Hints:
CATH topology of chain A: Eukaryotic RPB6 RNA polymerase subunit
Structural class of chain A: mainly alpha
Strand content of chain A: under 5%
Bound molecules: magnesium ion, zinc ion
Strand order of the largest sheet of chain B: 1-2-3-4
Distance between the termini of chain A: 58 Å
Oligomer: part of a larger assembly
Shape of chain B: elongated
Amino acid sequence: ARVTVQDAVEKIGNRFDLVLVAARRARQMQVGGKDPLVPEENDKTTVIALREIEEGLINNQILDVRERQEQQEQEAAELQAVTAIAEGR
Amino acid sequence: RSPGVFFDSDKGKTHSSGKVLYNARIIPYRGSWLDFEFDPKDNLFVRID
Amino acid sequence: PQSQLKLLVTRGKEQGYLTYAEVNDHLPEDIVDSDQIEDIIQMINDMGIQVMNTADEDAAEAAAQVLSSVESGRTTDPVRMYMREMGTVELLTREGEIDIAKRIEDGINQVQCSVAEYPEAITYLLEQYDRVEAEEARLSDLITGFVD
Amino acid sequence: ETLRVDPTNDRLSALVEIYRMMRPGEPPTREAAESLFENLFFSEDRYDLS
Amino acid sequence: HARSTGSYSLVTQQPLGGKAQFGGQRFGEMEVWALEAYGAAYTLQEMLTVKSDDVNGRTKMYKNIVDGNHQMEPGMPESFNVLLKEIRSLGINIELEDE
Amino acid sequence: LKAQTKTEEFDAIKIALASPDMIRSWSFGEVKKPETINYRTFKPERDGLFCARIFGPVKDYECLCGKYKRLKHRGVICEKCGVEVTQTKVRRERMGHIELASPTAHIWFLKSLPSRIGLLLDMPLRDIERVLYFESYVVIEGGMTNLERQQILTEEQYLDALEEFGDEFDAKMGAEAIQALLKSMDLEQECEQLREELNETNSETKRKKLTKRIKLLEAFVQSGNKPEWMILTVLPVLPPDLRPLVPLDGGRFATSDLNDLYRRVINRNNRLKRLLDLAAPDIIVRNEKRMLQEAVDALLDNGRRGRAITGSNKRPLKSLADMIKGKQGRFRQNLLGKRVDYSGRSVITVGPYLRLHQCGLPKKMALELFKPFIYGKLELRGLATTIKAAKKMVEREEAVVWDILDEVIREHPVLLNRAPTLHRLGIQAFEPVLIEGKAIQLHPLVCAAYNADFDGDQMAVHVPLTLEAQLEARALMMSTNNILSPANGEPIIVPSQDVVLGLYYMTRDCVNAKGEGMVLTGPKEAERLYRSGLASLHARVKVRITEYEKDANGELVAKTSLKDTTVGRAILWMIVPKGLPYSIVNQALGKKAISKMLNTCYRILGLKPTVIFADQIMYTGFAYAARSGASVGIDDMVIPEKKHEIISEAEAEVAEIQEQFQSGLVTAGERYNKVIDIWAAANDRVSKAMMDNLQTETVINRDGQEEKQVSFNSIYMMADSGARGSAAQIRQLAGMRGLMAKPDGSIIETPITANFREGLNVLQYFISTHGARKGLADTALKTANSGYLTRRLVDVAQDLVVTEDDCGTHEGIMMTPVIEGGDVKEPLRDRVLGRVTAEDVLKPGTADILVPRNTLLHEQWCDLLEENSVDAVKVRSVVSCDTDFGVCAHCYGRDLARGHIINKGEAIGVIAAQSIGEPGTQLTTGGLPRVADLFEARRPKEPAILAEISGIVSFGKETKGKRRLVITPVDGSDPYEEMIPKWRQLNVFEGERVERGDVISDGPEAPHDILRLRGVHAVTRYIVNEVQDVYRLQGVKINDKHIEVIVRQMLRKATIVNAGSSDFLEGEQVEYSRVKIANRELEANGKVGATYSRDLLGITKASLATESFISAASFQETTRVLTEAAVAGKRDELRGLKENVIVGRLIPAGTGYAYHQDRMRRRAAG
Ligand SMILES: [Mg+2]
Ligand SMILES: [Zn+2]
Ligand SMILES: [Zn+2]
């Protein structure tokens, strides 16, 4: 278990934003679109996310960048599909 | 409170005058209350219940 | 020599506090109502409260309290205003009943005669009875019976 | 001084004022004032100290 | 005593024990202040919305709880909606603006 | 893009008057019949209070008559009886209406002492009522003839006036009259006249009321409301499901009183329609109209009038306003409390084996609580076919499920809460540990925060369902994450009783023992020496220890030496982590020292070390306390040998003064005082006998004859260590106890000479009884008092939350030590600790900046200031913060559960109020009511009057009621003359000059005076110092911060003086004002900016001012608030805590602050 979030708070200083960001990440894992960035000790997605905050490999900037990238990951797929929609003309 | 007549004061707080006050109360076992009470002008009063 | 409500007010202000019983009797002989008090404790309470902590504005909480004192007669309770409003109407005399009833008779019979002097009022009845015997209607829906 | 603050004059007047105090809003009656006042502290029915 | 999901009151939908299975603990104003002093909004929202007063929110939540997904889709508590209707039943028009 | 129509996530709310057509919009049908149900087939009679056609189907997706019962047919309106088949929930939604035959006044607007119709029409109430009941006529638009427009007439008067003028004169009576009045009224014209009339005549009385009314009028105009709507045409009917007819056992029904009321209204209205069609005489139809008015009024708010009673039941039927108001004070359902799922409760136990971060949770309880999670996991791994099977499994309690539970419990925290919740620590999150039993195991160190004894107190558990709730619980509400009181930085995890007696008995020394004087390599073989029975736990010994220090930059330095200590302290040192000095464990280790140990550990090593250290401290405490064999015997309480003698001599004194009273040498009162004084002295004598005797009396020998030290006597160890008991109570055990007072409050001159160890005879006990009962009652009362204070306080603060980061103001208050009377009743370091510097301060020499500008002053910094001789520091405060509508973190301070500076978005008003109110139980002019009077701004009974202006003064006029004091300013004029009642003894020198805010008399001073005459900082200092005097006198620690925020809320308003933007005398927000002038100092008029005056408002008065009406409708009087807001068409934008709590969405603070921020910015923008 994660007894003290002091280090996670140390990384992102707001400490409410810690809860928010860690929640976002814990969601990325819980209903799986993704997988952990740190070894899972059987710790639930909550604690895994907190650990990920502690190791500095996860935060608002990083997550936003990843999601914005994924928008174009899917945009590249539909590239032919939606351009086939020229029927709007 | 036992049925009968009862004499009280209400000294101090009443009208903040330090003049005190005095009231008698007739409390029946069953029936209406008969109250007698003074005022700062020293005029005796009566109230039923 | 007189004006009542000042008096409970002016005393309630200088003492700074008045018992819930203090206002009841000190109230004028005019407003005795039970639910009267309900809002007026809220009136005196924002200005110098005793409900037995407020607004120091006062002012209009007096002028409107004097408006409620002038508003202190009519107790409402429509049983009352009714019992009083009908209590004005004078009792009928045994002959007066006959007078009024005769007047009624005069009126109605007037409108009936006025009906009988209208040709269409006749023709309509004729055509309606023509519909009755034609099984397009019934006798009960035309006449209640004649004189008979 | 109490008498000087007394608005009434005779027995009937006082009875009217008492009846009006107990049951206000409604017109007083002689028989009503007498009945009430006698029925308050003087009645064997409505009053007992035991 | 303990409760997860029990019966509910008809007038306002709120947890009520009818079976001797007990109703939930009452979360009061002081407790709300306690959650307010802490930075926890979500604990409070789920406390007074989904776990209790939201007729949709409770079931919609339960399905997620069993699905393995922890979220909430809060909606509007039934108490405040009842108060909307009670206020609006008078000559008072109360509206929810904008978008 | 098209904005939207259908349901989205809405913003704010609007409230206003309803149009007849607007009312008809909600209504899906008119209820024309008083009937409810068919009486045999319980189905609703068509178009009646309960109806399927108008409102909805009695069963889901099923038509009434039963034609279309299929879930397929939906938008179909049946041909037999039109009912659209839809969920029965829409019977809880769809409204209804009634078309009233005659107009009817809306009682809320008619009488809610702003009689709204009245002050809108400038027409007195009694006239309006006299009209409504047809007790007189009232003119309407009288044109030009003989008469005023608002003028009222009588029967004869109306007939006469009508005979004189047939037309160009108009009068009506009843509701129709008031309606015609309101409708005819043109607001514009009235405005146009009022402005001119305002401008012409000069009188206070005239233009005050004039300007007030014109303001009211233009407000009503901008509202969008129209006067006619105050008079009801259409009367909406509430949905049937909200006033259920639902059945019960034994065939009996039960229903809301709203059905009775609505039934009355409907019946009387219908009878009025009939009487209109039958052409009844006026005497009748009037009576029916009055009855209708009564019916409607009773239906809306039955509070007023005569309170009609429900059928067969004496109790008055509850009306709609009584439905909104509710009862039990001011409680709106989201306030008083709410039943919540996923929760529980039970009796609690100890569980010392627990870590600070966990709590024992009963097996069965955890099973029932996590049931949905258990189902989900069970069918997630595949142990169960379907959800039903999972239910059946856990209902069977098959051996497997337990392990599954162990999975769902692991990282999933639970919430623990106690009954008297005051400070935020009242609810704390833990990690569940499965337990066999029905009781909840609660960590000992937390027992302080909860104020929870083990005598049968119960605690409640909650489950943080959503992910955000689990993470909120772990990163905020977690036990280990809050180790510090929010009131003051001191540790709340301080060991309580058994543990401190353990560390006390451990760390301590007697004169001679086993292994006295020997030497050992380290703590290891010290403990090894003790556990083998070779060396005594407490013995004077030199041992080699290695202590570290982090004093190098970011780096631990190691050093080792020979310390003179005891075996026990050496053993205890094994626990002490890293850089802490040995000096901390080398003392006697009392409850205070053991606390400062943890505190220093936290401000040095950080959080985690402090936590685990605390745990180990608890474990070793309980351990060695157990080993100690500490007990309490009857011989442990030692009565002074000299007690009886003191009693005798003091008993001689009373006979001396008695004989003096017998000889008339002394008066009665003087005798009384004398005897009471001699006994009062005797008490202290015996006390300070038993105290010495119980303290140092142990006389023991080391290698010599004798020597003496602090006693190892049990009860003394308990009282001294801080475990439990105190000199006051020990005094009552051994020495005599006090003098008692009769219920009158007259203290008896024959004190109780017997103590508890001795037997108390009948009298003494009977006399003790009074004090006992008064104690119980008074405490039980001060509970409620404390609670009430907390309520007023949270009501006055609430929405205040850290919003900006740094306002960047140099402004602040000057912090010096209190220096009261003799030396230092409170230091400087405490006052300035955890606070930011306003400006860079200096050494005694300058061009040397030690603390630069704004820097949070922490332990090291304050110690640096302590190194230097610095006597004062200017500190930024919440009261001086330039940020509008909140506080910037830079100004607030640091203190929290964490030593770091306050977070952005933390709600500080709530925790301020909580922190002020929580200790308030311990408070006893003086006392708790003193605190209340202070926060209430109330002027004292017999106050002192300050000098209105500086300069030489003189006593003018003569005696009538007052003797006037005339001031003489040097340069300025002297319009100021204050009439000071002369029967009050003065102070001011008639031949001397006095500065503004000097003492022109003695006695207490009204804080309003301090604010106006002296200053904002002066008064903000007065409050905080006075309330802190009250608290500190009782030994209570409350940081100046909280009180300072309460003060900030107190002075929130102000009254304008000059003009050029807003009105003259308006009380208004300093925030609004300052925003408008700082905005007006540039652009606009070059500067038109208006002057103001800051105003002190009592907390209960300041709480009255709130922008959100949903908020105000909670704690204030509901009816008046709703009405007063409705006529103004006030639009509640939410934005506050309370309103968002009521509406049931994320709080505009804490975690939800990001949401509300982003949303607030998206709104009022592109
Ligand atoms: Mg207890
Ligand atoms: Zn049908
Ligand atoms: Zn600031």
